[PDB]
Design a protein around this ligand. Sequence first.
Ligand SMILES: [Mg+2]
Ligand SMILES: [Mg+2]
Length: 278
Amino acid sequence: HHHHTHSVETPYGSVTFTVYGTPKPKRPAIFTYHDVGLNYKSCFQPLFRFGDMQEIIQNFVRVHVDAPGMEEGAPVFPLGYQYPSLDQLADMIPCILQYLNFSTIIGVGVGAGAYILSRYALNHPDTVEGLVLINIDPNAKGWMDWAAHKLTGLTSSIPDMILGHLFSQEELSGNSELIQKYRGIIQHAPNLENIELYWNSYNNRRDLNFERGGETTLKCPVMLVVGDQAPHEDAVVECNSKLDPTQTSFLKMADSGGQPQLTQPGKLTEAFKYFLQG
Ligand SMILES: [Mg+2]
Ligand SMILES: [Mg+2]
């Protein structure tokens, strides 16, 4: 698993990205963006290093983004630091791609990462050959979503609420080895204060429109993924109703829970194969 790690300076701060494999003339880069509370390794290593996935992605160059302050070893931003909005995080992507001189990507995002890459694709559609969107929720919180959030926050800590964004309450109750591991990752994150600022940016996101005036806005192939009964199911189901069905696939996974790329890498690998196959 040899790689090389870079960053770029942008008007909204520095962002880190890690490159595996080598670029090739025909082919897009697989470009990933992780969810709140994770980084590229805790979000994507279990999938990307799954043996059957290694086979599928070996000949692609992979560019794995760590959002600002989420990279391994990140300093904790001083309290008061104004963290980029999700839109601003999407606006850093052209800098990364310009630095690498990679003109085309297949974006793979989870949660907030899926929003960010969707925003990027709307901004620069001629650079995106497809998107894999896990747990995408493109809607801003309304008054009532804020009400629910704030009420929950009376009895839940920030880390509790981030774990509830990532996993179903049923999973969190069941103390599987995975959940125990990820509880520790989030609760005890040395950069938890940074993670919280990314959480806030996610919660404050504006509407991202996959349709306008009843017409779909995204023009690339999209593979939607969510767990059945998982926190973001209704949002992903709604996205599926707004995208062009001739260019869209939707895996609602029966037994995946909130982070399907962590629990069902075998099933997701076969999905990835058919998404990338020529
Ligand atoms: Mg353009
Ligand atoms: Mg709308």
